[model samples]
Target: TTLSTKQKQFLKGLAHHLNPVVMLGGNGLTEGVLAEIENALNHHELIKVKVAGADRETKQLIINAIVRETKAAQVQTIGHILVLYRPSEEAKIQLPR
Candidate 1:
């Protein structure tokens, strides 16, 4: 789902304090990684993920795969760090301003 500018900004700020919940190792996107991502998304609408792989292409591939699987929107990506957003069923935490 597309977020409004305000919503995106709020989420970006919220993401600033969050560490990577899931790490993509050399094995790339594994089942365990996917499960962790799902669990994280269920709890947090926005989350950061750290991708460690051979090169930029591989890292991008991993991000793409995660996005596709979790149906999360790509907020921002810098180097090996990627930020994703997936609205929770019940947003328990208020988004930042």
Candidate 2:
């Protein structure tokens, strides 16, 4: 599902202070990494992911794969860090209406 502009901004503000809950190593996106991301998204609703080393194109592909795999929305991406959000059933972070 696509997020509205207001909702995206709300989430971006909420994610401002959050550290990267998951970091990608030289291994890139692996099962373990995916699982960690999955668990983090499930618990945190919004998370910052640190993608290291890769260039912009590679990082974009990786981020896209992660988003597709986790079924999460890409709230924002800056440099090597990507902000991802997926509301749990309980909806910990409420977006603006």
Candidate 3:
């Protein structure tokens, strides 16, 4: 489900307390990395990712790809850190209505 603007704002606040759970490796967005991202999202509904080694355009491209591939909502991106949100089986995080 797509997150509303208010929900995204709430998630952004929640994400502030979380550290980057996934890090982009040299290989970039491979299947393995995607799997890891899936697992992380499963465990933590809201998580951060540290994306490195790329220009602004490249980084934005990669981040968008991650969101698209994972079917997660992109909360915010600051510097090299990207915040993503996707509800898990338990629906751990309750976003604002």
**Best of the candidates, TM-score:** 2
- lDDT tens digits, residue span 15-73, model 1: 78999988878777899989998898898878888885548788777877887898988
Instruction: List TM-score per model, in order.
Output: 0.86, 0.95, 0.90
For 33-87, candidate 2 gives per-residue lDDT tens digits of 9999999999998999999788988998898899889999899999889999887
Better of 1 and 3 by lDDT: 3
CA lDDT, every model vs. true structure: 0.82, 0.90, 0.86
Report the lDDT tens digits of candidate 3 across residue range 1-97. Answer: 4988999899888888888988996788889888889999999889898887777998888887898888988899888888988888788877676
| Clashing pairs for predicted structure model 1, backbone only | none
Error of 1 at 57 (Å): 1.0
Backbone clash tally for model 1?
0
TM-score of 1: 0.86
Minimum summed lDDT over a 10-residue window in model 1 is located at 88-97
Candidate 1 to native Cα RMSD, angstroms = 1.9
